[PDB]
């Protein structure tokens, strides 16, 4: 490409992922939260866990970034100084910048805040803002139907010929952090234990809740459907002879107790069922808030021909996200192939790199032209400062 060393940052709802363009790995993957140690001390950094292993009074893991993918603590996010110096070890004023959630066209502001954050707060001489689900589609596809089950929820974004279908961008509530509340809630008798506590809750989400999460599951069909089908299978196997796959123990070793936490296969299924069926946790959330009819984001994309939108999306499905790396995509294939069987779901996904796929797409920085993306000059701030 061109002789450039851009800085590639992905700011998720929970993870702040930072490196450069000339390194295909991030230099760091710290939280987009902070253990505000209490002085206030916005402790960013994953291991800086250990402060929250103190579980200290006054230590408060507030997020910087809420569940919309937009930061609510921007000067503690100016974490950006922590990135560039304590992690990147470079001046931001040296290097260009690529920073990554889609919306409906209203907050297109935050850029002004990034005019604060890259020109005033850090004086990065040029910064490019890329769209994170479009970046996931990039790392070489033009149009996509991107579902990010990140920490924030199930974020559905239709993308047609590179443009964002603004009315159809839907972001669910139910992702990593609600499942942190869920795993803290259901293994609560087995852990025998049962933001500021974010120093308890985020710390447990760093130690054992994630250890129950990367180890949670999604049923490949609906868990009620898989449950009835596997109960019918086990009844066939029992009545023919005189085993159910869901009755087996997925025991969890709660290392703050070193204790067996027997949740079954269906039990670990039931957590990620709430992402597709959040009526199972609270009545105020519809199945439409679940990822299946979220179908609706296909249908709202049909208004931008609607069946051509359906053709493009349901033959160009894209799966990404942290909570999507919980096992069970086949739930998406089943749950949207029953709401849209017309176009067969040819899905794409980074399967590893999935949780930092916005970073890898922003890294794709390494475009061969500066004209391929809008790179903001300080003069571009000065033009946006006028009228």
């Amino acid at each position: 490409t061109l002789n450039r060393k851009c800085v590639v940052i992905h700011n998720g709802s929970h993870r702040t992922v930072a490196g450069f363009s000339n390194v295909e790995l991030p230099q760091c993957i710290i939280p987009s939260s902070y253990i505000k140690r209490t002085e206030a001390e916005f402790i960013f950094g994953t291991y800086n866990i250990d402060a929250a292993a103190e579980k200290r009074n006054g230590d408060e893991v507030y997020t910087l970034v809420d569940s919309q993918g937009l930061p609510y603590n921007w000067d503690a996010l100016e974490q950006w100084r922590y990135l560039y110096d304590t992690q990147l070890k470079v001046s931001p004023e040296e290097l260009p910048l690529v920073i990554t959630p889609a919306t409906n066209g209203k907050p297109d502001a935050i850029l002004e805040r990034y005019y604060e954050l890259a020109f005033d707060k850090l004086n990065v001489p040029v910064f490019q803002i890329v769209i994170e689900p479009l970046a996931i589609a990039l790392s070489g596809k033009s149009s996509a139907f991107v579902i990010d089950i990140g920490a924030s929820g199930c974020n559905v974004t239709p993308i047609i010929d590179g443009i964002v279908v603004k009315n159809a961008v839907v972001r669910s509530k139910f992702g990593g952090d609600f499942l942190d509340f869920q795993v803290h809630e259901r293994l609560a008798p087995l852990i025998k234990e049962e933001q500021k506590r974010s120093t308890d809750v985020w710390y447990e989400a760093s130690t054992w809740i994630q250890q129950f999460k990367s180890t949670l599951q999604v049923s490949e069909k609906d868990l009620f459907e898989l449950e009835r089908y596997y109960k019918e299978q086990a009844d066939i196997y029992a009545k023919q002879q005189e085993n159910n796959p869901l009755v087996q123990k997925k025991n969890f070793l709660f290392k703050p107790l070193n204790k067996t936490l027997t949740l079954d296969l269906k039990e670990c299924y039931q957590f990620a069922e709430y992402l597709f069926k959040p009526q199972l946790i609270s009545d105020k959330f519809s199945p439409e808030d679940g990822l299946g009819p979220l179908a609706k984001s296909v249908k709202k994309a049909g208004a931008s021909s609607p069946e051509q939108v359906y053709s493009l999306l349901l033959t160009n499905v894209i799966i990404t996200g942290s909570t999507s790396l919980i096992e069970g995509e086949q739930r998406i294939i089943k749950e949207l192939s029953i709401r849209f069987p017309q176009y067969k779901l040819t899905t794409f996904a980074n399967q590893v790199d999935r949780k930092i796929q916005g970073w890898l797409g922003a890294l794709t920085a390494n475009l061969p032209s500066w004209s391929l993306g809008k790179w903001y000059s300080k003069e571009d701030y000065e033009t946006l400062k006028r009228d």
Binding site: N3, R4, S91, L95, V126, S371, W375, Y376, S377, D380
Partner: protein, 53 residues
Amino acid sequence: DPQTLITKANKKESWRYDWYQPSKEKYPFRYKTWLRNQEDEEDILDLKEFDRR
């Protein structure tokens, strides 16, 4: 002399870490990168002293 040993050694560009302004012509920003330096752009210890033996 150290520079005479150095120029006697390993036998050629130079390179710089510089502000480039990229072209579309030039952008109203600039940025640092390793730009190509063009053509126009001490003492000795003896060894076997620090030799572990």
